[PDB]
Design a protein around this motif. Structure first.
Motif, PDB file in Angstrom:
ATOM      1  N   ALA A   8       5.926 -20.517   5.533  1.00 47.87           N
ATOM      2  CA  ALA A   8       5.123 -19.490   6.197  1.00 47.87           C
ATOM      3  C   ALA A   8       5.831 -18.136   6.174  1.00 47.87           C
ATOM      4  O   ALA A   8       5.278 -17.144   5.698  1.00 47.87           O
ATOM      5  CB  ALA A   8       4.806 -19.908   7.634  1.00 47.87           C
ATOM      6  N   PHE A   9       7.068 -18.111   6.673  1.00 44.79           N
ATOM      7  CA  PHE A   9       7.864 -16.881   6.717  1.00 44.79           C
ATOM      8  C   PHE A   9       7.974 -16.251   5.326  1.00 44.79           C
ATOM      9  O   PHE A   9       7.776 -15.047   5.154  1.00 44.79           O
ATOM     10  CB  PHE A   9       9.265 -17.180   7.275  1.00 44.79           C
ATOM     11  N   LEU A  10       8.271 -17.088   4.337  1.00 48.10           N
ATOM     12  CA  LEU A  10       8.476 -16.628   2.967  1.00 48.10           C
ATOM     13  C   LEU A  10       7.194 -16.028   2.394  1.00 48.10           C
ATOM     14  O   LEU A  10       7.228 -14.998   1.717  1.00 48.10           O
ATOM     15  CB  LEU A  10       8.988 -17.780   2.085  1.00 48.10           C
ATOM     16  N   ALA A  11       6.066 -16.673   2.678  1.00 41.62           N
ATOM     17  CA  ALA A  11       4.763 -16.159   2.270  1.00 41.62           C
ATOM     18  C   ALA A  11       4.531 -14.770   2.860  1.00 41.62           C
ATOM     19  O   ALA A  11       4.048 -13.860   2.178  1.00 41.62           O
ATOM     20  CB  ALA A  11       3.653 -17.113   2.701  1.00 41.62           C
ATOM     21  N   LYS A  12       4.892 -14.618   4.134  1.00 40.25           N
ATOM     22  CA  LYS A  12       4.794 -13.333   4.822  1.00 40.25           C
ATOM     23  C   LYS A  12       5.644 -12.280   4.116  1.00 40.25           C
ATOM     24  O   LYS A  12       5.192 -11.161   3.902  1.00 40.25           O
ATOM     25  CB  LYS A  12       5.225 -13.462   6.297  1.00 40.25           C
ATOM     26  N   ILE A  13       6.870 -12.647   3.751  1.00 40.47           N
ATOM     27  CA  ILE A  13       7.778 -11.714   3.082  1.00 40.47           C
ATOM     28  C   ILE A  13       7.222 -11.272   1.724  1.00 40.47           C
ATOM     29  O   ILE A  13       7.180 -10.078   1.424  1.00 40.47           O
ATOM     30  CB  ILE A  13       9.191 -12.327   2.889  1.00 40.47           C
ATOM     31  N   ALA A  14       6.795 -12.241   0.911  1.00 45.18           N
ATOM     32  CA  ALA A  14       6.232 -11.954  -0.406  1.00 45.18           C
ATOM     33  C   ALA A  14       5.022 -11.019  -0.300  1.00 45.18           C
ATOM     34  O   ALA A  14       4.925 -10.027  -1.029  1.00 45.18           O
ATOM     35  CB  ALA A  14       5.844 -13.251  -1.107  1.00 45.18           C
ATOM     36  N   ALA A  15       4.109 -11.335   0.619  1.00 44.02           N
ATOM     37  CA  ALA A  15       2.911 -10.521   0.831  1.00 44.02           C
ATOM     38  C   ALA A  15       3.282  -9.126   1.338  1.00 44.02           C
ATOM     39  O   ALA A  15       2.841  -8.115   0.789  1.00 44.02           O
ATOM     40  CB  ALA A  15       1.966 -11.211   1.813  1.00 44.02           C
ATOM     41  N   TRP A  16       4.109  -9.098   2.375  1.00 45.86           N
ATOM     42  CA  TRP A  16       4.584  -7.856   2.992  1.00 45.86           C
ATOM     43  C   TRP A  16       5.208  -6.924   1.949  1.00 45.86           C
ATOM     44  O   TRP A  16       4.907  -5.727   1.909  1.00 45.86           O
ATOM     45  CB  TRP A  16       5.584  -8.217   4.109  1.00 45.86           C
ATOM     46  N   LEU A  17       6.062  -7.484   1.101  1.00 46.19           N
ATOM     47  CA  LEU A  17       6.717  -6.721   0.043  1.00 46.19           C
ATOM     48  C   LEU A  17       5.713  -6.258  -1.011  1.00 46.19           C
ATOM     49  O   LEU A  17       5.706  -5.092  -1.401  1.00 46.19           O
ATOM     50  CB  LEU A  17       7.836  -7.556  -0.600  1.00 46.19           C
ATOM     51  N   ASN A  18       4.857  -7.173  -1.456  1.00 50.09           N
ATOM     52  CA  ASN A  18       3.894  -6.868  -2.515  1.00 50.09           C
ATOM     53  C   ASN A  18       2.804  -5.927  -1.999  1.00 50.09           C
ATOM     54  O   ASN A  18       2.097  -5.287  -2.783  1.00 50.09           O
ATOM     55  CB  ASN A  18       3.280  -8.167  -3.066  1.00 50.09           C
ATOM     56  N   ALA A  19       2.675  -5.850  -0.680  1.00 45.87           N
ATOM     57  CA  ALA A  19       1.748  -4.920  -0.048  1.00 45.87           C
ATOM     58  C   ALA A  19       2.352  -3.519  -0.032  1.00 45.87           C
ATOM     59  O   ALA A  19       1.658  -2.527  -0.252  1.00 45.87           O
ATOM     60  CB  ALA A  19       1.410  -5.374   1.369  1.00 45.87           C
ATOM     61  N   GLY A  20       3.659  -3.455   0.230  1.00 49.88           N
ATOM     62  CA  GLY A  20       4.372  -2.188   0.209  1.00 49.88           C
ATOM     63  C   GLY A  20       4.641  -1.714  -1.205  1.00 49.88           C
ATOM     64  O   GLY A  20       4.768  -0.513  -1.456  1.00 49.88           O
ATOM     65  N   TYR A  21       4.731  -2.666  -2.128  1.00 56.16           N
ATOM     66  CA  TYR A  21       4.968  -2.374  -3.539  1.00 56.16           C
ATOM     67  C   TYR A  21       3.986  -3.136  -4.432  1.00 56.16           C
ATOM     68  O   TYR A  21       4.305  -4.220  -4.933  1.00 56.16           O
ATOM     69  CB  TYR A  21       6.399  -2.748  -3.942  1.00 56.16           C
TER      70      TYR A  21
END
Length: 112
Positions: A8-21
């Motif tokens: 879950a956390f990792l999915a959040k990180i990937a999305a969060w990052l790919n949303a910012g970039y």
């Protein structure tokens, strides 16, 4: 494609990052990005990010691991760490709530 792939956390990180970039992260931002990111994420987690993303495509040479190799040697800039962290904070700040964050504790001082 994505279907309960990573934690879950990792999915959040990937999305969060790919949303910012959505355009990828340039080196000048990658180094401080990692400096900020690696604070509370483990080696397995930071890798897990790459492991998920390369599933999409690994044609990009924007590799996330290489940054840590640079950071261990020489830090980028506090200003850049600032600019990136705050730029990312616009999308979110998952690092505040780790799905697994049992921080170690083995203190042995000793009074007399």
């Amino acid at each position: 494609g994505p279907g309960s792939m990573v934690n879950a956390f990792l999915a959040k990180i990937a999305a969060w990052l790919n949303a910012g970039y959505p355009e990828g992260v340039p080196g000048p931002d990658r180094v401080p990005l990692l400096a900020l990111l690696t604070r509370r994420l483990t080696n397995d987690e930071i890798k897990a990010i790459a492991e998920d993303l390369e599933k999409r495509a690994h044609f990009d040479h924007i590799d996330i691991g290489v940054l840590i190799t640079q950071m261990t040697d020489e830090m980028p800039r506090e200003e850049d760490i600032e600019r990136v962290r705050r730029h990312l904070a616009l999308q979110g700040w998952p690092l505040d709530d780790p799905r697994d964050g049992e921080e170690p504790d083995g203190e042995s001082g000793g009074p007399r």
